[PDB]
Design a protein around this ligand. Sequence first.
Ligand SMILES: *[C@@H]1O[C@H](CO)[C@@H](O)[C@H](O)[C@H]1NC(C)=O
Ligand SMILES: *[C@@H]1O[C@H](CO)[C@@H](O)[C@H](O)[C@H]1NC(C)=O
Ligand SMILES: *[C@@H]1O[C@H](CO)[C@@H](O)[C@H](O)[C@H]1NC(C)=O
Ligand SMILES: [Mg+2]
Lengths: 695, 321, 281, 651
Amino acid sequence: SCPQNVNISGGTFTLSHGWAPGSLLTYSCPQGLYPSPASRLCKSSGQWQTPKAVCKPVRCPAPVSFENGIYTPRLGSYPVGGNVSFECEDGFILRGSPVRQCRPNGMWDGETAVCDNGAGHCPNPGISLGAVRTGFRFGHGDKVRYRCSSNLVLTGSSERECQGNGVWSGTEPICRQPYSYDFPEDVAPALGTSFSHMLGGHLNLYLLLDCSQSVSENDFLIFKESASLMVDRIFSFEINVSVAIITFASEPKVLMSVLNDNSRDMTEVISSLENANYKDHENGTGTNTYAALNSVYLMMNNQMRLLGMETMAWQEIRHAIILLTDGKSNMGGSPKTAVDHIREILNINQKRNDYLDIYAIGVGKLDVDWRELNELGSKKDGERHAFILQDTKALHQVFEHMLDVSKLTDTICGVGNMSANASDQERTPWHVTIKPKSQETCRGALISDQWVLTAAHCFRDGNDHSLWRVNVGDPKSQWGKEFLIEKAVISPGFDVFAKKNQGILEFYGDDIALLKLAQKVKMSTHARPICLPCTMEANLALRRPQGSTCRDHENELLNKQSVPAHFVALNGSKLNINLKMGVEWTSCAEVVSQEKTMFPNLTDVREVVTDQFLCSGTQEDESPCKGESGGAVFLERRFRFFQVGLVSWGLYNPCLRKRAPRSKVPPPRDFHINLFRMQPWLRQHLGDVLNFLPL
Amino acid sequence: LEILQEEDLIDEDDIPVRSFFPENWLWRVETVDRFQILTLWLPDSLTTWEIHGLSLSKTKGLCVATPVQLRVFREFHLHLRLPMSVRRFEQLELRPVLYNYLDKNLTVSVHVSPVEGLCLAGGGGLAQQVLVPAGSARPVAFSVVPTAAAAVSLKVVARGSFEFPVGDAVSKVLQIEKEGAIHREELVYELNPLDHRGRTLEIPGNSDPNMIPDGDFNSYVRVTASDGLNVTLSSTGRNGFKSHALQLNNRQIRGLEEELQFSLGSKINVKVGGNSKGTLKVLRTYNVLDMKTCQDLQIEVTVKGHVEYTMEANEDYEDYE
Amino acid sequence: SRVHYTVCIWRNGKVGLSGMAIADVTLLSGFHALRADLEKLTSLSDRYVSHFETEGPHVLLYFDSVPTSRECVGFEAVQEVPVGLVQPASATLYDYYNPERRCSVFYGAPSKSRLLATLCSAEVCQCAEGKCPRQRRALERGLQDEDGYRMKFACYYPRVEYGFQVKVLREDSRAAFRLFETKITQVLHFTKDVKAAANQMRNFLVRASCRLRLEPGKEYLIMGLDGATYDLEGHPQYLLDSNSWIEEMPSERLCRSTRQRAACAQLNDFLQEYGTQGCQV
Amino acid sequence: KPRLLLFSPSVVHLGVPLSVGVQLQDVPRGQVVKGSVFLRNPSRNNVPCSPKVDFTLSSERDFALLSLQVPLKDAKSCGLHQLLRGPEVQLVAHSPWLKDSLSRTTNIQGINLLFSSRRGHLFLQTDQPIYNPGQRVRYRVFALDQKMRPSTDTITVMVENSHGLRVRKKEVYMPSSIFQDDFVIPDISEPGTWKISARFSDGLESNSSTQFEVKKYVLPNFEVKITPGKPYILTVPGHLDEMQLDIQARYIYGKPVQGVAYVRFGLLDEDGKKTFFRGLESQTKLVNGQSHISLSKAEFQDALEKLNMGITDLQGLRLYVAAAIIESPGGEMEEAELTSWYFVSSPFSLDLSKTKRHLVPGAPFLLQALVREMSGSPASGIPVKVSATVSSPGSVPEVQDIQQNTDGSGQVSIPIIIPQTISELQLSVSAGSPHPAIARLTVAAPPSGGPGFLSIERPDSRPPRVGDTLNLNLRAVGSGATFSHYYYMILSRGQIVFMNREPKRTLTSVSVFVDHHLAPSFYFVAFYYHGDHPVANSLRVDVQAGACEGKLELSVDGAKQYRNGESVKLHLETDSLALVALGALDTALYAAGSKSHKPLNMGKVFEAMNSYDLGCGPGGGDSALQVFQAAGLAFSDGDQWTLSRKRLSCP
Ligand SMILES: *[C@@H]1O[C@H](CO)[C@@H](O)[C@H](O)[C@H]1NC(C)=O
Ligand SMILES: *[C@@H]1O[C@H](CO)[C@@H](O)[C@H](O)[C@H]1NC(C)=O
Ligand SMILES: *[C@@H]1O[C@H](CO)[C@@H](O)[C@H](O)[C@H]1NC(C)=O
Ligand SMILES: [Mg+2]
């Protein structure tokens, strides 16, 4: 028999078939340590073959390069419990967590630290710890290539390109170790958010389970349990969804079909899943993942034939695929080819990318590789799709809290239609019209089912809100539906004549007002609130971790020195602006010293334009009119809309459907109240409505 | 016959690598209220840092301080100098040099961490054995053929014996340029906006048979203000339609020949204005296969005899498997 | 023990040069030049070198006259430690007046090659350096299969991502590799190269320095690691190294022999079970 | 008889105050004057480009300095932006007094001045002296006004590449007087010397620029320095000194390098064409990091015979030494060039710029010389022999021989006595023995029959310190004491700073307090009046030992022996709230650079003070107009006025 001197230092070991030849020895070490070697081979009664054994400590990737900054302390590879601080040079604003304590799983915590000056068209993608980047140009259409260092394996996008919409193609690469794994608590929010986007029409869901000899009967039972809870949850949301169950082996066997109408009923799908057994899989105990993906491909091309080439009923069909596999594809070829076929056949591109998400949940500890899960799963910015959990217990744990979406809170926001054939209101459902007693018209934005955020200057006649009216979008008529107002809260710091003693006729500081409607708005395709940043709602809309802060939302949404934004015109059309931040903000707002009517006695530019204002209007930018004041200044990220400001005042009014610029003194210039500088006031008057992040 | 020590060396895990090699640091500007202390972290590079210093105060004008020489020395290090130019698929020889300034004999194992994209000798896992006499230096040669086509992080390590616990590790990112050499394609067009025929001009697109895929196509325009051109370049491009307008004269004449980075794929157009005899030079750079051993000098070294390997570098059958 | 070097120099331009030249050869990893031989060289009237300096793996010679013809000199060195790894060294020649007019040569070991053996085809190369293919022989030697050694090599370590039984059509030598163009009898396993099928051509290349022999007209079972060379024709071209299983397929007469019936039959049993069913894991 | 004097700098700078001196003479005791002074346009139109400033004087107070302001808006509106040909402006004093007293046709008395928009001090420094292609470049500029106080005026920076084309331009405001900025060099940029320029937005001519070198290279590990035994080579036919070099090479971190040195000799001329010696190349093994080689007698003679060159013609050429040391066994290459070696006929050089010209007859001649070692530091204790030949005043010329050693830093002040009615004076200054340095100068004499003369005597020839009071003596020569006082003014940075009157006495003295801002060179100008003919003399005084108005001290705790990665407690000491700007530079950058760029130090700042000085020589002149022109002022007394200077250079 094999020799018994196979003890590991600081850990235990297990055997499959005793000391008989051909038995596999498994090495286990406590958390924060890794087995080395992981497993041994008893040979043909020979010496214990290995691909002295010691539980070497977990050691964690160190920053190979940190552009435009410094990092302390500097070490070859940080140990468990260690900390690293990332503060960088002047003129550069930090993103991500400045302090990262590396967890016992071989990963750091928080988003990767990088500071960008914003001059580049796209935000700085940064160098993830343990990785390198090639190409230091962030212009539109340029590319960056990432390469791991030492013995790390790359999970993520090995190549990212700066797209037109200001978001790099693919996910953020993260160099990982062969022995690193993921905690259920870390990955549950990622899965929850990604599925929330898959839900954001009818959705098609495919569940792929593993039943080879490598996966045990109990492990397959836990796979079945996790799939059943997942299916139970997806049907509890009352969404148009069909789920299919495929359990693959050396040859794939389909247990449920989406062609069959039966997939939309919970009892039937759970009964079909429970009828699965390991026995019907002993006829071939391989892992042919390409075969299962080809089965999905045949499934959807049958759906393609039966629905039609061009019919709307299929175009709104989104696909999400889950794989609960041990990542040991050993037959049928590379699984990536079938994913290539799927991408080719759904016509996936930079726009239809939302219609296809692949989740590659690996399970196990000894035959799990990273490359297959990374390649198989999809790669999208701000999300993670390739995971591994050491045990199936962890799989059940992460799934049972995977959709932890707070019950009855609701308050969705920032959902619109981006089709040109859609109506103006349906494209911008937050947009409302405000009628004060002065008979002049202003705009506003729905921030909830009851509250509207607008500009204070729109109400010059006083504070008698009972004579004011609002019109929100309404499906039944383009005129909208008129509501009365229960109460009005104008910012106490607002006074257009506060600075008259210094020769400034009109000062728009604190030009913000919150209006409560008499009746709750019925949510529909013409009436939805816009996500007010720096809350749980916008955080879920932005695909970000739970522990995000308000400064984080500033850094992310207002992430460039020139950030494109939008406002709604009088006729309902969406116009284009660019917000100037940082250094360019000062040059943007300096043209107020050349005004001739508003400020005849103006010696300090900061006195009329403060930090409370965003600045826009250069280039070919559109200039809002007086009637458009109070409307939301919003930006689009990740197919959701976010209000970073609203129109306050401008140095040129084009409306003095019709518009006209000019080319003399003064050049057009506009200022909008930056919502991020008013956070205390919205928190005072809105804390019991939205759930605000820590500042 | 020669005695070799195996696995009685340092564990290679405690040795602190050196990665931060900035040519300059401490670029910040500070506000000092007659006294300030700075806790600055020394970079790993082994040179002397000449700390400059300038003062600007609202009451005492300007003062420039005397530079402070600061020395960093380790007494035993693996100094490595990457070649100035490394090309993909082209063979280079990294030269890590071990300086032993102690008063004792030291025997050290030097190896390069195996990394994807680098073709080393024997897979990169084999460690070269060298001995550095006290108060002297010894070089060790590593041959590498990089095929990564991108920047790659190598980590050369020296491991002393457990009897004498010394060692150094260096990890500098090695950038590899794309295959082939660079080629410059300058196109000169005299610019007379007075002649109406010269008001518009079309530059032919580049179709170079020898241009290498991923050619790093960069176009820089060189327009001379010698006499008020308003030359504007509009161009349809694969990335998009970008147009940059150049006003060289700026109603002023002090050496205002201009040069701007101007990013296109294939096609470019010119709109002219003003009154001058300026010159436009669009510069195109791309990779190309071309060659040049010297044509003037040549050298060839032949070796004959028996050399002994360490039984881990013999590429032959084990004869028992 | 002792190795005889030979450093040779000459010039061809005859115009661009400025006269004298500087020799800078670096010995192997574990060699230092002998000062006695160098001083004997420099003591001769027609020494061809006016000065020298030698410490450890670095040898300096000052050539004051580089002629058109091949005129040169060699010296002897000794070994301190065994060469830790197989690799070519470099010898450089500088110009005395214009050192930037320098240009190096790479010289190999006494028996090894000049440059790092790498397999380039199309616009990619794979690092060909490594270990010799074993050419496993169990049936011909008569050793019975133990614990399914071939299956164990296929499924546990090194896991095999390509496996075919190939009939070697021809043997050729290209660059530093000996190419064995072959025809696919059957495809047991495959990860990449989805267009693998029988009666198809594949190029299998091994470094010429090794002694591995694939006799034409005979079938072998080939398994191992996948390569990314693409053969410049479209079909992936594989390289034979370590982690690659090479076995000779049974013939009409060697499997007939007595100590070989069980071994050959077990090998075909493996062939059918692995081609048809799979790793079973 | 009564007169009004107008004093102003010959060049007026826009946007900064202009100082105008005004003086009366032969004014009745009870009489008073009233008026205003301002600039105008140069006959194009008669709009005042400056707000009027009043000046009221009487007999007891007959002098006053007026801080006249010249705002940019008035200068633009009145038309200094619209002249033709050269820049010129008119400064005029208006008062009803001329018509009332002198019965002059006009109440206008003025001067012709040249207006220039250069103003303020602009300094800027880059990240490194030398960069690789494709590397990020950081830099910053500092904006200071005339008094180097921080300034908030807007500036526009620009970047010019190696060929000289603009690559960048940034128009930036100054909240903090410091503007940091970075840009990336193109990857395909060939080696060259780039340039960064910074100008004030409204100041067209106020361009200050620095240069950084771009070159393909890699960071060297060690540097080689060739230090000659003596920085001069004596080529006199009598003998030739030995030539020996000490080639040193050290690892930058301190230790010496073990290797070999390859040395190539040659003759390099002024133009730059170098002809090497075929043969005589020296190769040696470095011992203790140093190699001491020398050129023999017969070897060098044979080299010149091979080049068919003689010793006598070796004048102005240089012995070029090039070294290319190979580190062994490292194999690294490093090159060091020597080009400072000069073949000279004397080991000393005489600088006779400081000796004042056109000195007065009847007062001591102050001959000042600078005995500087040829291509070295100033020499001390080196005797100077000087022969003065006073040319025929009516009698035979006489020879005056004075000897005096240099007191220190090459300073020698030899006060030879000049007799009256001297026609002209010839001087022969010779310093050094043997092989002296010969310098000959000739000075004429003021025309005979002049209205008078003024002599300035400086008892202490040593340069004044900062904050050190300087006292001068003034003596009228060759005329009666009709006048009662004389008037003097102090010029620093091209502006009149001080004006005062001292009564006429015997062996008088005037004390000038050397303030810091007067450094490093201020003009003392003095004049009196003999009837209606002004006579003046202006002595130039240089202040050395310059130091900051404040102070900035950098210090590192403990000895300068650290190990990589540990902490440094850098110490910053100053005397006020300062925007201290720091920078850490690797020393290897200096070695890798082909030309060693000296870092910014107080020499350049103090030269920046001198860049605004309009002085023309060490002062002095035959006439009052010449003295005033050399000092850099414009004088109008109503009858005779100095013309505007032809050029700023004053050749
Ligand atoms: C080091 O090696 C040298 C050369 O072999 C030898 O002479 C010396 O004794 C050794 N030991 C020390 C401490 O220098
Ligand atoms: C160039 O364009 C400017 C734009 O302001 C225009 O005013 C000018 O006339 C143009 N230049 C010439 C020489 O016409
Ligand atoms: C300013 O620019 C002029 C014109 O190019 C140049 O001659 C002069 O030297 C510059 N002044 C400086 C560098 O101080
Ligand atoms: Mg399996």
